[PDB]
Amino acid sequence: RNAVPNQVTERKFLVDRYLWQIPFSSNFLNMGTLTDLGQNVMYANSSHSLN
Amino acid sequence: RNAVPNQVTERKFLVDRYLWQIPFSSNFLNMGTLTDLGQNVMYANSSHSLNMQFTVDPMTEPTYLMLLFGVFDQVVINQPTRSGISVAYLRLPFASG
Amino acid sequence: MEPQREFFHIAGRSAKEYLSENLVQFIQATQNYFNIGEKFRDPYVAPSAGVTTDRSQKLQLRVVPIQTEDNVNYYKARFTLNVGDNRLVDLGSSYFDIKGT
Amino acid sequence: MEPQREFFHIAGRSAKEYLSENLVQFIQATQNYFNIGEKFRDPYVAPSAGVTTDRSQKLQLRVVPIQTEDNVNYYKARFTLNVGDNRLVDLGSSYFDIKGT
Amino acid sequence: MEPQREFFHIAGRSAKEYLSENLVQFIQATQNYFNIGEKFRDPYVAPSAGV
Amino acid sequence: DAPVTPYIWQYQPQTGKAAGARQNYGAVINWLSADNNMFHRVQTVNRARNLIDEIREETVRPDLAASFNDWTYDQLTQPPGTAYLPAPDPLTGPTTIRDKVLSAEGEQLAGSRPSVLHGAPSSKVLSLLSEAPRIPRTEGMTPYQFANSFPPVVYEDPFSQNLAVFPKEFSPLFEPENQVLASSLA
Amino acid sequence: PLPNIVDTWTDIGARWSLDVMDTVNPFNHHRNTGLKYRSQLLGNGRYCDFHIQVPQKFFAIKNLLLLPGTYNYEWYFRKDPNMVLQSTLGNDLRADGASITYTQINLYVSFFPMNYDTQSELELMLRNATNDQNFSDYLGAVNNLYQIPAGSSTVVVNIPDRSWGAFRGWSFTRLKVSETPRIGATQDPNFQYSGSIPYLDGTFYLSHTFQRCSIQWDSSVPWPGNDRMLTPNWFEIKRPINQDAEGNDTMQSNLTKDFFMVQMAASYNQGYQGFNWPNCTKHYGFINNFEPMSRQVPEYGAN
Amino acid sequence: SSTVVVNIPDRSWGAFRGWSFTRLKVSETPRIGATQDPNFQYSGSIPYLDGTFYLSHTFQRCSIQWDSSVPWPGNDRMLTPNWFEIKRPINQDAEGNDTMQ
Amino acid sequence: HIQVPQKFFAIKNLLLLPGTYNYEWYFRKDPNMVLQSTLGNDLRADGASIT
Amino acid sequence: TFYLSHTFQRCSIQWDSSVPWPGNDRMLTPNWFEIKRPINQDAEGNDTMQ
């Protein structure tokens, strides 16, 4: 009944024992070990150089 | 060592979250989703009423009894044209009861 | 719409049968990432042909003992089981309903 | 670069294909007590063409209500889920993202 | 008369192949509501030579 | 000197079977206060409607009556649809490979041409929309077929034959599990 | 509470639930780990913001697959604090200053990036009339809330003559009137409770107190009526011991021999070849939460 | 009570013309088949014999089913397609469906 | 009021055909064998009895 | 036995110093991968899992 007004919420999350994985495929599913884009980068055998 | 004699035993049971079921089958087993009495010619092609009385323990306040009838709720849906959709709702046996 | 039990698939053909042959070959190929085959109802019907009779008989069957004996060490129970004509018993369902103080 | 892919079995033939047909019949007989078939790598290849488009297409769509209504008891919202051509949505992926106080 | 290993089904014919073939087609029909099944023994025999 | 009333059939909407047959009360002329002249006029138009029904029951296609309530797939009217043409290769689509080539040249693409519906090179593709199912329908008649076959039968003498041609199908509690087998019996 | 109703001596040595706590909702507890987790997931204070994701639970549009076209998808949300929010004590949230309000919502969908010529084959297969999508409600039931008056025991229900073809079975509990709302109206003014609703949640707890049950078709022909049960006319569920004469008491409890069978035969396909603990047990199953109990009391009155 | 279920068994249904229905008080309706009605303690206007119907409201709903399954008119003819909806109490109303205020 | 099984293996799963059968079986009244105490004392000395 | 996964905000991947990933306007924020956001900077409601 004597609760303070003007309260602000704070949200967070804890993730343990997990590497953030981002797969190298089109729809980010698992349609194969050798993925879709793993075969499509090999078009004309050029190169890429990412950051 | 000096327990009181002539004592009497009292049994009861607590059932939570269950919703007692009575299957409409001949041997009360699950031989199919569509049961065997459901496609029996005696019950399908004829009309019968239902008188079904219960007996519960008296409580101190009013109480609903949540009676459920096992029916077969089904839909179909066709989309024959772009921006076109249509359904057909139909359940056996309690079509608008 | 009629016959209203094969149209709404209460009974009749299974999900691999009332579909197009081109669509069954699709939902088997594109299955491990884009599931469609859970969107089609598959019936599952009882036999209702020669599995349970009209003739009146009991499901569970009490018997009383014929004659009993009480000793200081043991108690004798003696039963006469009757399996009638065209009946059938599995003895795995047999158990003693013993009762005392 | 293939054929250095196919020799190291990144891609190519499955485990019951590049092995000799007498060895496969050995490791299926002696399987319950002396397992060998986990010592042979088996490729698993995504189809890479014909499944996913290349063109610029939004993957997950937010849509806000057209014409709401607010009173004491309820709160209407009305959406125009505008599925264009060449797009497919399962409504299992649909949910209302409600923010309030 | 029939030998002891064969009569009591310690070794010999499996349950698919000493029943009546109209009992096998009967027990495979039910299998769920009234299982006969396990009222018949199945010999499981080590190879004992060449292993 | 009075003809009999024809037995009308009962169609069960679920399962499509016939649920017995009762006689056609509810279409009976009340002759019970007619003299000898109006009674001959009334029983003439009763003999006229039986003569129409005996013509119509001549064409009952007598192997539907043999497998009564036991109809299989080749005796039922199926929904129309073409045969099976195999689905074409999606690699041979008009814009599938060129999207993998024009983008890998450096472009980013967005946009497409509407389809044939506006939302065998091409007859194989458009045969997907009018295709029959794999297994046709078994065990059920549409009311289009239950009215085309099975007219109201007429039973000129009531129950004065052998018990083998006893009309057991007229009872509503008739299952197809019994000793004697069905045939063309009025 | 009064002091002497419980202490460390009450029903000592006896696994026995209290006779007056039986018809009291056990989910109105602070060890209710779901409600404690659902309350702490929002926050700890009084004034809180929230950001939630709600499903679509209507079965026809639960997992429908859509083809191209412009669609129109509206829906009404509730604002009743007794219905939306759950309290541990189960008081009136309408009475105090509890209020829900919505500042903005939006719908999220996920378009699968299918190839434009693979979709052109899959659309044509689903525009076909023989590839119509079928869906079914998982429960498949008809809700009927027949009312027991306060202090009564016998309730007769009456259904006039219907088809009864492809009928599946019965299911029944008891629900308190104060704990069960009226959903068919836009707002229930007689709904003064805000704990767990057993009509909407699973949470049934009055599954006992069902002394007898009898099914009868045309005020004649009892069902099953072919001398199937032990007492072949009615489904006797409880028989209180000191009235029982010959068996009829499974599990060291009041549940009868004939009716324990038709619950194991319905749920777990047993009864004819011996009972055992089943392999796959669901959350709303029978033998998971059936708990018998016993105690003794001395005779009272004389000395 | 607030629900009537009227059942008719099978019949020829040839050249059926239509339906008509009201409500009548039991006190205001005699049984004419007797030579004198002993339970008829009323002498005002009889709506069963005069015109004088006045309880032609209080109906709310009407549902028609053929052979317990087939609806009429089930061709999606009405807005509420499974039953003729007669009254709709306002504050229980969203999508219009109310005439003449 | 309890329910005791039959655990001899030629009856435990026997599928019995029609006919009249006589099924006699003895029960123990020994308190040390039937009952089970925590401390493992002598119950036939400590007043325990069953009937 | 990691414990510092909850402390990433952004993952911006760029192929030839000109081409982002996944590109093609896939995500709601297509240019990078926005992992966590403070809720005061969220007025548009792009937060899962409460």
Add this chain to the structure above:
Amino acid sequence: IVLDLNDRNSELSYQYLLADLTSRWHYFALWNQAVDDYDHHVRILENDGYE
């Protein structure tokens, strides 16, 4: 295409569907998927005194 009846319960039908597909023990904070339970030693409490 959403024709809504009063004899239906889409709320409880979802609660029995979720107990069929997934386990009920786990807490999935997206759909607020947390099971209403009680304490097994409180409802059906067992008075054993004290050690």
Add this chain to the structure above:
Amino acid sequence: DPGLKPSSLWTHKIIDSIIANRSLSAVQNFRKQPLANKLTALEDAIVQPRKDTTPETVAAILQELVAMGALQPNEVGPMFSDLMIRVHKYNSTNVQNNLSVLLGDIRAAQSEAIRSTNVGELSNQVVLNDFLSREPAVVPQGQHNYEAFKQTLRLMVNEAPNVTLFKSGPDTLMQVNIRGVNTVNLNSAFKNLKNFWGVQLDTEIVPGSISSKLSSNTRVLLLFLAPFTNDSTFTPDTFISQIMRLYRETVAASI
């Protein structure tokens, strides 16, 4: 049979299938067996176990009275144990001859039904309709080639001049007059053709590994059925529809 007859009697018959009539397939199964399975077949050469044929003879005539419609099928339950309890009591030579004469009239009643109707002309169809019975009748990835393959197989049974179409114990063979490799196992040809119905000739890195999994058994079956089909047959642009127009034009051209 009701049936009172067991199937697969190899523990009694494998040892006089090697000595008498010199079966090579029975030798290959016999060497494979373990030592315990092997010693239970060497005594049955020495002493053969004598089986009582009385309950199989009594049950043979109870099934005939069901077949003539004399008594209902629920009555051979109680009436069989009432007739066996009589022949256990009053067993004599005059009774054991009465069972054989009644049993001799069962076979003579049905052998007259074979020669008069001439169902021996249709002896190919009876073995063949028994073969197409326990089959699944619904295949995945197929179902129009699969239904049409059975109809052209029933056409070959009726239209070919001399096909014996006999059967061994587990399976069904098929013997035509082309000398050499006459026989075709129809059972193991339908396990090889289980997956190859709806296969379309698109996904081939190398041609082969689709037509190479066709064994030498089922390839001869595709050679025997090739002249008796058409182009109004198997659905076009599939794998089986282009075999059957390749094997047809290697027979219609090799004349």
